[PDB]
Amino acid sequence: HHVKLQLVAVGTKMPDWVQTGFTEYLRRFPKDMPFELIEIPAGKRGKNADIKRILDKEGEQMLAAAGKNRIVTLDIPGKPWDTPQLAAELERWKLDGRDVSLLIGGPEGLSPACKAAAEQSWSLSALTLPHPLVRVLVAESLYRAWSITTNHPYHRE
Amino acid sequence: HHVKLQLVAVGTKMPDWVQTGFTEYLRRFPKDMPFELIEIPAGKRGKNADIKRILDKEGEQMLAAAGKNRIVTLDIPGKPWDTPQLAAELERWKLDGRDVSLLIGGPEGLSPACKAAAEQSWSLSALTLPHPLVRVLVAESLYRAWSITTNHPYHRE
Ligand SMILES: C[S@@+](CC[C@H](N)C(=O)[O-])C[C@H]1O[C@@H](n2cnc3c(N)ncnc32)[C@H](O)[C@@H]1O
Ligand SMILES: C[S@@+](CC[C@H](N)C(=O)[O-])C[C@H]1O[C@@H](n2cnc3c(N)ncnc32)[C@H](O)[C@@H]1O
């Protein structure tokens, strides 16, 4: 009865250094808090493409991936959680008992349906961050939040 | 070479993926806005060490590297600039004409003198970020800010 953290993200080819950095954090998560990545393919964009519909198809794929999971969106206008707050949230998710889906939008951001479906929305920064860096920050900050919950040396070194 | 952006940062041994990611951004700044790294070595800490002094000695070195430059600290309680705001600031630094020293603290954070010396302070996140990731986020966000000022393709879509 341990909870799963699922990063649901649009885009499939992280630069090598980003994937290396992401894996170094992902792998340090304990067996009772598995951290896993689900990549959704980005819709093909063009001037002749209807951008709303491309975005909705992306969102539909994300929400389908989340299933019945608790839905948390990564979004610039979400809650600017500090590290103690994220640790408190991480603890709340565990009591809740449901797996958590963390949603990272593609180039055009999150679909309206995804923003609407969010039970919580989490802002990493007031800055517009590139999708690969969002992946790494989420992994690192959750790791730091987790290490606070178990008094692991990482959060205090 | 009108204004130079110099990152003054405590710590010397970045993980490889971090140096790769950091350089990837650094090498893309144009010759007329050079982005450079100055590393101050971290003081050797021990449970018998005077942290107050170690911190002062780090700051002393930082402030020496900055010289007469515009001094901007990276600090959690600084200004939570969004990306357009950072572009405007970058534009204001160019008008000022002074090179900009961007200060990143060591394991114990910035010295009292460095915080005192700051003309501006810049917050990347409400999160407690690890020193390597601060380096990468500063390089990318300034690169994105630069690309906005020059109507470069990086920041669009
Ligand atoms: C390049 S951004 C596109 C942002 C989009 N134009 C918007 O305003 O919603 C791609 C995705 O990364 C995530 N992201 C980028 N910056 C973020 C931030 N500062 N805080 C939280 N999530 C962020 C969001 O999930 C976003 O959908
Ligand atoms: C290990 S952190 C220390 C965290 C915290 N600022 C402190 O004083 O203990 C090292 C440095 O990274 C920078 N830093 C960490 N998180 C930051 C954030 N969210 N925004 C801007 N700078 C940050 C600060 O310059 C800090 O001195």
Residue numbers in the entry:
A (entry chain C), B (entry chain D): -1 to 155
Paper text:
In bacteria, uridine 1915 of the 23S rRNA undergoes two steps of post-transcriptional modification—pseudouridylation, followed by N3-methylation—that convert it to 3-methylpseudouridine (m3Ψ). RlmH acts on the assembled 70S ribosome. RlmH consists of five parallel β-strands (β2-β1-β4-β3-β5) sandwiched between two layers of α-helices: α2 and α4 on the solvent side, and α1, α5 and α3 on the dimerization interface. Our data suggest that E. coli RlmH functions as a dimer, with the SAM binding pocket of one monomer and the C-terminal residues of its counterpart forming a composite active site.
The crystal structures of E. coli RlmH bound to the cofactor SAM or to the inhibitor sinefungin contain two dimers of RlmH in an asymmetric unit, with two cofactors bound to each RlmH dimer. Each of the two cofactors (SAM and sinefungin) binds to RlmH in a bent conformation in which the amino-acid moiety of the cofactor folds toward the adenine base. Three bights (U-shaped, curved sections) of the overhand knot define the SAM-binding pocket. Bight 1 (loop β3–α3) and bight 3 (loop β5–α5) shape the hydrophobic core, which hosts the adenine moiety of SAM. Interactions with residues L72, I74, L122, L127, V132 and the backbone carbonyls of L125 and S123 secure the adenine base. The ribose of SAM interacts mainly with bight 2 (β4–α4). The reactive methyl group in SAM is sandwiched between the backbone atoms of bights 2 and 3. The methyl group faces the C-terminus of the partner RlmH monomer, where the RNA substrate likely binds. Comparing the structure of SAM-bound and ligand-free enzyme shows that cofactor binding rearranges the C-terminal loop into a 310-helix in each subunit. Our SAM-bound structure reveals that SAM binding shifts the C-terminus of RlmH by as much as 14 Å, rearranging it into a 310 helix (close-up).
